[PDB]
């Protein structure tokens, strides 16, 4: 999806402009465009803040939000796309936990749902919400065992 | 001032580099290297690891690090001035800090502001000096946008 370009495009900006403003080379920025958010430096956040008018904090949040929307979310993307559901706060919380584990070099095995998808549900939205809350809880408990 | 950002952060949260290394598997010598870096070199990965161990959101971690950095920054000459007269203007100091770091991220040097007129209200006058300097950097930035 290319994270840097998505942010720039959201604000009607280009890597062309960013390169002229900052002196950062065209190929460096093409590289930057391929990087996952975990590789972004505060320096790049500051450059984007400068050109976009957003605080550094708000730049990071918009990039997180863009990344979150293309992320596998450890298997939940499939479930959310399939059933056409949206739980913004919970999805973001799950995303942040997943990225914490990644930053600690700890693998997060995908949540899987083959029994869930091969069973009847009274309310699918309620049931997926519950599954997402349950996944958040397991990841919090997994984190707690490390602290 | 070349304050050790990582240690200052961890110390404020009763944490050590040793604990951070335990959590993340990042070797203690790598964290010693990390401790020597200015904030502009910090990755989101590091911010996330600090968020994980501290219980603070990534946003709150970033802001704490920025505040630590800002409070030891030369502020293009204003630190000496602010220290001399024992004055504090947190929002204005931070806005000046933010602009300076924007320019540094754009490989643009900010030379220090230079400073015997009469002052009845030194608080007020240094505050305007600071506000004036902010405007200068904003105009300099606007010319580039």
């Amino acid at each position: 999806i290319k994270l840097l370009d998505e942010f720039l495009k959201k604000h009607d900006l280009t890597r062309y402009q960013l390169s002229k403003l900052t002196g950062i080379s065209q190929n460096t920025l093409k590289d930057q465009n391929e990087k996952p958010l975990n590789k972004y430096t505060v320096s790049i956040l500051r450059s984007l803040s400068m050109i976009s008018g957003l605080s550094v904090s708000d730049v990071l949040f918009e990039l997180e939000d863009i990344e979150k929307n293309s992320d596998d979310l450890a298997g939940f993307k499939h479930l959310l796309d399939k059933y056409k559901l949206s739980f913004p706060a919970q999805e973001f919380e799950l995303y942040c936990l997943i990225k914490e584990f990644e930053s600690a070099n700890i693998e997060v095995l995908p949540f899987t749902f083959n029994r869930f998808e091969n069973e009847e549900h009274v309310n699918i939205k309620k049931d997926v919400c519950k599954a997402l809350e349950n996944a958040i809880t397991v990841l919090k408990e997994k984190k707690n065992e490390l602290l």
Side-chain angles (χ1 to χ4, degrees), chain A:
Chain A
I1 269 289
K2 301 334 167 183
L3 175 58
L4 178 59
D5 277 350
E6 284 300 323
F7 169 88
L8 292 176
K9 286 170 31 159
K10 291 214 329 148
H11 296 277
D12 302 277
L13 300 171
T14 60
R15 268 177 292 122
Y16 169 77
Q17 297 167 309
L18 183 57
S19 183
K20 292 173 71 176
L21 169 69
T22 64
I24 299 171
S25 74
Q26 176 197 48
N27 289 338
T28 296
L29 285 182
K30 181 61 173 171
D31 183 25
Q32 195 73 35
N33 197 33
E34 299 294 347
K35 293 179 181 170
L37 190 52
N38 67 76
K39 297 301 189 65
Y40 277 51
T41 55
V42 168
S43 185
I44 291 296
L45 301 181
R46 287 169 170 168
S47 292
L48 296 175
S49 166
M50 186 182 188
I51 195 170
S52 71
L54 280 61
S55 65
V56 171
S57 185
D58 281 343
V59 166
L60 181 46
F61 178 74
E62 290 202 349
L63 291 166
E64 283 174 306
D65 193 55
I66 295 171
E67 189 180 50
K68 183 228 85 176
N69 284 316
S70 287
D71 194 82
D72 185 67
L73 297 179
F76 272 90
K77 182 180 206 312
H78 165 66
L79 212 59
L80 296 170
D81 285 347
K82 176 167 176 179
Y83 296 101
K84 299 300 187 284
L85 304 174
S86 176
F87 310 106
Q90 289 82 5
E91 293 165 17
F92 194 70
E93 186 170 27
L94 178 72
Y95 161 83
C96 290
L97 284 161
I98 290 168
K99 297 306 181 190
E100 288 172 23
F101 283 106
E102 169 182 51
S103 79
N105 299 286
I106 293 162
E107 202 214 327
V108 179
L109 287 173
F111 301 93
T112 62
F113 303 96
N114 268 322
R115 172 157 206 180
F116 184 107
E117 296 191 52
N118 285 284
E119 288 185 341
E120 161 167 74
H121 300 270
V122 161
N123 191 296
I124 177 68
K125 171 169 289 217
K126 280 178 180 30
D127 290 351
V128 173
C129 166
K130 184 181 63 89
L132 182 56
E133 299 186 317
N134 288 344
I136 290 169
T137 299
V138 208
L139 288 192
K140 287 179 183 174
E141 289 171 338
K142 185 189 226 294
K143 177 163 63 162
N144 187 53
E145 298 270 344
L146 307 179
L147 302 176

